[PDB]
Design a protein around this ligand. Sequence first.
Ligand code: QFW
Lengths: 57, 57, 57, 252, 271, 271, 271, 238, 60, 60
Amino acid sequence: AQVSTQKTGAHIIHYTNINYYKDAASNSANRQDFTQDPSKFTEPVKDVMIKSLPALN
Amino acid sequence: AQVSTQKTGAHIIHYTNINYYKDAASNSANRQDFTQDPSKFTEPVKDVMIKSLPALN
Amino acid sequence: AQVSTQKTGAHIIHYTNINYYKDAASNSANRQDFTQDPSKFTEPVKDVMIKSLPALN
Amino acid sequence: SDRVRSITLGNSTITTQECANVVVGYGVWPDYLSDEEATAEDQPTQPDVATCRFYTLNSVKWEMQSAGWWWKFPDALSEMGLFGQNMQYHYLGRSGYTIHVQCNASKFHQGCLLVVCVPEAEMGCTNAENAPTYGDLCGGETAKQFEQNAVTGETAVQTAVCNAGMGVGVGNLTIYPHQWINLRTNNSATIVMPYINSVPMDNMFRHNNFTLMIIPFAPLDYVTGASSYIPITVTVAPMSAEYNGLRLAGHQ
Amino acid sequence: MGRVADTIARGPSNSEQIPALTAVETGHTSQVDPSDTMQTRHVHNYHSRSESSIENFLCRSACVIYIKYSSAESNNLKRYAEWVINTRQVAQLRRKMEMFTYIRCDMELTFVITSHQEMSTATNSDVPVQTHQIMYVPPGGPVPTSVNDYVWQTSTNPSIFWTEGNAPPRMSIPFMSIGNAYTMFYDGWSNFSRDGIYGYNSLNNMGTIYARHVNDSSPGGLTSTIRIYFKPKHVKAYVPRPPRLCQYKKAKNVNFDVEAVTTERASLVTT
Amino acid sequence: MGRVADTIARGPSNSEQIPALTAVETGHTSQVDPSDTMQTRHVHNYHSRSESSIENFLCRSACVIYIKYSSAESNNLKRYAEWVINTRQVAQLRRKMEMFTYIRCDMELTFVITSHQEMSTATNSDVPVQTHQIMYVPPGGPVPTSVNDYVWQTSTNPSIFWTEGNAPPRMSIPFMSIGNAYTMFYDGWSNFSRDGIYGYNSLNNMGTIYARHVNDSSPGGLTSTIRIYFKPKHVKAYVPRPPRLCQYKKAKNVNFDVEAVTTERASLVTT
Amino acid sequence: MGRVADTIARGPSNSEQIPALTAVETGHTSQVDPSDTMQTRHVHNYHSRSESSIENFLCRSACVIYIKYSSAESNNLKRYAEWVINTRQVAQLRRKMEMFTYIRCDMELTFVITSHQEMSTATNSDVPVQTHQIMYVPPGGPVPTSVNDYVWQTSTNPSIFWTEGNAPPRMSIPFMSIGNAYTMFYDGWSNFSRDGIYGYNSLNNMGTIYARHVNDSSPGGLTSTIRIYFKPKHVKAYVPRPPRLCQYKKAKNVNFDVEAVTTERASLVTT
Amino acid sequence: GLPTMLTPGSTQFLTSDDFQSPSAMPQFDVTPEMNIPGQVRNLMEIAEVDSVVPINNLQANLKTMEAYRVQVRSTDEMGGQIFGFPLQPGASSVLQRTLLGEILNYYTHWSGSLKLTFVFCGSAMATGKFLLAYSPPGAGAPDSRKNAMLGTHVIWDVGLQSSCVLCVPWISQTHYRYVVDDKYTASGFISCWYQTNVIVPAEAQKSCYIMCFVSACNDFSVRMLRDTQFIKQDTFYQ
Amino acid sequence: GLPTMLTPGSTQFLTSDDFQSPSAMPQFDVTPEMNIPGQVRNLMEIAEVDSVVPINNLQA
Amino acid sequence: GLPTMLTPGSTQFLTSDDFQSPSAMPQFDVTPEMNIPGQVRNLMEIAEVDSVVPINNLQA
Ligand SMILES: CCCOc1ccc2cc(S(=O)(=O)Nc3ccc(C(=O)O)cc3)ccc2c1
């Protein structure tokens, strides 16, 4: 059994999941992975550009 | 698992709940919260009025 | 309860099985046994033949 | 200053004295394939400096009514040096690139270009029952041209910048590795594309990993009595080129 | 968590720092916050990007086709139906996946199978509850040519048997591309010549679904229609693309008709 | 626990203490017990206020609408039905919520879907078990204009598929107001001008439910009627209001007709 | 795990080692890798032989027969049906098992039972939901001669009772050969004389399935058809054989018609 | 068996559920993962990237490249308003087919600040100053440059740095706004004015262009998935 | 599967039940709570407040 | 009984599933195993064995 926090607010709060199958494709979708890395689209530059400085010196 | 007392009389008496979902909106309603504070409607006065004393001295 | 790894990739990942019957013929098929021994068909020779050497000296 | 740069690859070197940084597409720098991501079991040839080195393509004339240009890769380098020779003799290849666009002007000229490398830039067709043919997708070292307005044909590529030749907003080609060349700022763009595919290696004639598109977003304009010929030159070097599946030359 | 940035308190400034000024000739886009362009208070911000994950965006079941078949063969539907698997015959699901160039995912296939009575010159109908088979035939398998043939024995072919009046049946499918991700857009050809099929349809070869009534035909006629629903699960997506601007024409091409960027306005200044 | 106060034993008194006398010109209301106005015994009192919690009061499913649709389109019901979500078309559920000004809660939506045979000139009916779709379309989504259109593909729109002869289907809905609580009464307007819609209907924008038969029409006709039930859960309510005195007129206004405070009596003294 | 061998890096060679040269006059087959015939790089290889196990190959349900029976006895189907148990009346399942000489396994039997209305001169049908019995009679048990006889009391005979509109019924069967494995091919005879039945049918004696409607016949007619599905489980197989080349003729013989080894080519050199 | 009781929604197919279901290819061995550049994990990694904004989307300019550029010139007066549009990044004609705006039309709610970058695409001998303004709503769009500078603004000075960002802050009564236009959820107005003039030599062009870009800030989020209204079909594609 | 048996009231919709049901907006992020004056938790906080009584409720 | 809810695919017969089902011969005593030469455990033990190739497969 895997016990993991629920999505809850803002200002019990766990659920239990047991996998019933021998394949990991059978498992319920992972909806609680909230990792991000926007910098490879938003800042894809060789030299690190500091915000307060000129872009082009 | 959460083990909590049942509603019972007056002059076994527990139940077990396991949450099966990843959201807290999916959970059964909280019916056993009996907290109160009637004083913000019933006594909403700046100065504390003592019952035995005059209201207005 | 028997807890065993699921089939998963490549570069949670366990499941739980409980048997509900008194016979082992009632059980789900064993799909995760990957033992092999091809040498009794592929190399069924009395004298061990070393690959780098002549077959017949 | 941040405006001066050199890039040396092989026996070639490029210099800039106005540039707006270098874009490393998706933050990943070219490298050879690892042993844990491989699937071709023969030894890879890595010609190093002999294939990795700038190759200047045919220049295009920027006009006031130009709507843009595109070159598909690896098929713009298919006749270029030993990079193009190793394409002939090998089933598989795999290469990253540094793409460098040059377009200088005076300070009395104005215009703005989008320089963008689009992975998997599959293109539409004028007739909706037909696929575009190779001659209309690719010109080799010569660019194929976008048109201002819709075109007709049977196997012609539907060209019309607004759709970008792909049926999408042309203004949204900015989630792809890109730089702008604005004539009042910089005279060069540099993009470094890693190898991007969903297979670790692939044939170099049957597939185009990305397309470089150069699209005017602010027309060329200058007062008559100034230079009226302004080229755009694209000079592009392979990086970490390696090939597997050696056999006789051809591709049919 | 997926919680967003807090606003940071900021006072008056007068310095040679220039967060507002930038060059967009770099591929880099500005990182400015409100805390760089005006006063601002501190706001502790609890908002989350939880539902804007790609595994919540793509993880809702979408109809990809429906196909009909008839016991009577009333209106040219045969006694079985077929569908070459693809995701490109529906606009809505297709567009969501085409915001990415490569996707690897598992699928979950749910089937919503319904039947209806047909007009007939038959009198007296008391037709039993229908059972239906849904058979998946991997590439290069034998195919039905009739409802009665040997291919419906399903000796190695995956198959569902389901009876009406029950919950919709579903099965998971794993990731199963030849490649290391599914390819939404292919700028190549299927030949080294550079002829043949061009586009993503070169790499499409995902088998065929067949569906029949298992029950023998009754004196009236029933047509059954099966709607197929795919839900991505366990997704990783790579290389973002623009959302589509143009309406699609074809399920094997991207061919498009030239369409407007945006809708009209009266002038530059509107209120 | 929610247990009430015990009565406290009290003897004769004669003092300058005056619990009975008070001024009601204060907003304060008297705190007097029986133990202040007469003798009284000690009563250990075990009674609870358990079921008078707001999370037991509001937490019973109440019908909020029903809407009808017909396979034949017999009596102008179309082949699908629609309902703009609100809680104000029913007197009973509305009144309970309007004893509060602001409520934040989760909902639980249960649907009770029934069908009936219609008069027809058709002969011989043996219509399969109906399947039905219930689609929720968030604000600014595409809407059905027919039963067959692309909107019922439900690629991102939440949807239920359910077959007759099974348990009523239900789904939870979370709290989802733009504000930090739902607003039962709004004394404002939707314009800064102070024109347009006035009242709580300014802030109402909760999407639209659509429901259809998924099965193709059969030679007779069936009308299906779907009854929608909302149950508040996990409630916090704020700012108590009087219960309604007057009957409602409209589901978007509070307009009312002038009505009596209480019922008649013959005189001041009645037995 | 079932993971396959990695490729090992290899340089130029020039030695008296000869991995390529071998004699095939030995029963031994060469063990050469690519790392013996050309350069090669190191490839860490994660591919698995997981689904090529014999317990995944044989472990998918395959139809082995279907048999029909009729309430009315409309078209000579009687009121009950029978089938002498064997695995050899279907090509697909038979071929998979005949790639082995001896197999011991447990089975899982699933039944897919359907019914259909028949033509009749009857008017007004409102036939209740059918119930069906499936009775297994071990060798040397009493057998049905009618639908009403004493044999359907099932006092020791294993039996399933199942009603339409429910999930397909299944039961496990254990390994149950007289021998220590089932025999797919028997090169003997059933007599010491060397007469009588020749082949594997000598050792076949696996009882008989009988199936009837449990409900009494109604004024119309219903035919029910029951499809029987066997899935091997817990398998051990011994002595690999060639897959079949020829189509089968008979379910008790291997008799075959002479057929081509492979399909045509134009010449020795083709592209 | 074990005593159980079925509860409402026992046989439903909800399209937003996640449940486990048996695989139809048991023990299938998937292809190994490899690193493919540009992995997306969130759609706010697409929304925070700049996208050219069609601020000149008049009827003639829709299918041309005129859409994405607004002319600015050397005026003989002060010069008036250059453009203005109601802010609403998912319902405005200007902003709703950008990357930010098409990721917004899969959602019903949004919150947070966004940033409008502007770039001068004149000559390097051309120079100007512009007032980039945001006005919170409840007093209409500014009809003078005086009323525009009572709002939030950045005065842009054209120089070596070719671009200037007007970051437009969240400023809202509610924690979220609707993607759809709603009068309660009104989001303000954007405008641009001449602060000085475009001043340029004789031998350099009097007219120049300006482009606008839009992207989300790092405080931006969206809620409540829904079908987009921008794609449709009348029959299955073949 | 696991042997189970259904008991009376297996498919009923009781309107006073409380059971769990899947959310139709999985992973939805609700608005933060704030303190709104005058939170009610019980209806005996409304009943214990004075209310003017119509003791002269004749027809006119 | 215990509150439960049925989910899609509750009554399906998938032919590639593996589930437990009651035996129809409870407490049946199977024949002892013995070693039979040539046990196969994988079909890559058959595929790795040489097989004569018809490279001259013309019509005659
Ligand atoms: C009777 C002859 C056939 O008539 C029509 C009429 C209208 C059609 C519209 C479409 S669509 O909008 O492109 N796609 C849909 C997908 C799924 C659903 C569903 O119901 O889930 C609905 C529509 C497809 C086929 C159509 C056939």
